[PDB]
Design a protein around this ligand. Sequence first.
Ligand code: 8CO
Length: 208
Amino acid sequence: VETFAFQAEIAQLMSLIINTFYSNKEIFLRELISNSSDALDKIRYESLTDPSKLDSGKELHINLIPNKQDRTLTIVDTGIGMTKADLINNLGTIAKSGTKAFMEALQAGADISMIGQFGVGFYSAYLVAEKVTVITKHNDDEQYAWESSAGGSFTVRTDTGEPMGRGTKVILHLKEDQTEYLEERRIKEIVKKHSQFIGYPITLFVEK
Ligand SMILES: COc1ccc(-c2c(-c3cc(Cl)c(O)cc3O)noc2NC(=O)C(C)C)cc1
């Protein structure tokens, strides 16, 4: 297991998200579904010139899986997946400018809900989660697990759990007072409100 420091600017963003009073927390789900949709768009496009890229799975979709026993909400997609370089360095490089822009906007009076316009919507996960685990598999790279409970650091390791084929699984370990996001009615409501027109099937799993 390797441990890394977030860039200062990203740690700052995460602290703001965690510490600011903001009741409209439900937007985290729109942001993560948006990221999944983007990753799905990417594998779809790439497959047009190289059909073999779908050898690791032809179906392009998003699954939402609540688990009250584990207090987790999992978002699974079969998008392009992230590489080790994506996880450790490259996405963060991009996230630095996006964060700076977002912070300046919040000063100009913007609100947290516009976070996605700056390409850093993932971090809105920390509105509802005490820990986030991201399992991801890109073609021709290994399956990795990224994890952070904030506090300035994240970890990356090669994942030895069940193989995914291709794509990304975001596991939100919810805060004790945010369990409403495990309720079927509530998830349906949020998807209908914010993610109505996503161009991939979204399947909301029900609990046993
Ligand atoms: C907006 O920034 C983004 C950065 C990366 C990704 C992404 C994901 C992914 C990531 C998160 Cl956090 C998620 O919840 C769901 C996902 O499927 N998997 O592969 C990816 N690679 C790309 O999309 C490349 C064009 C870089 C999506 C959006």
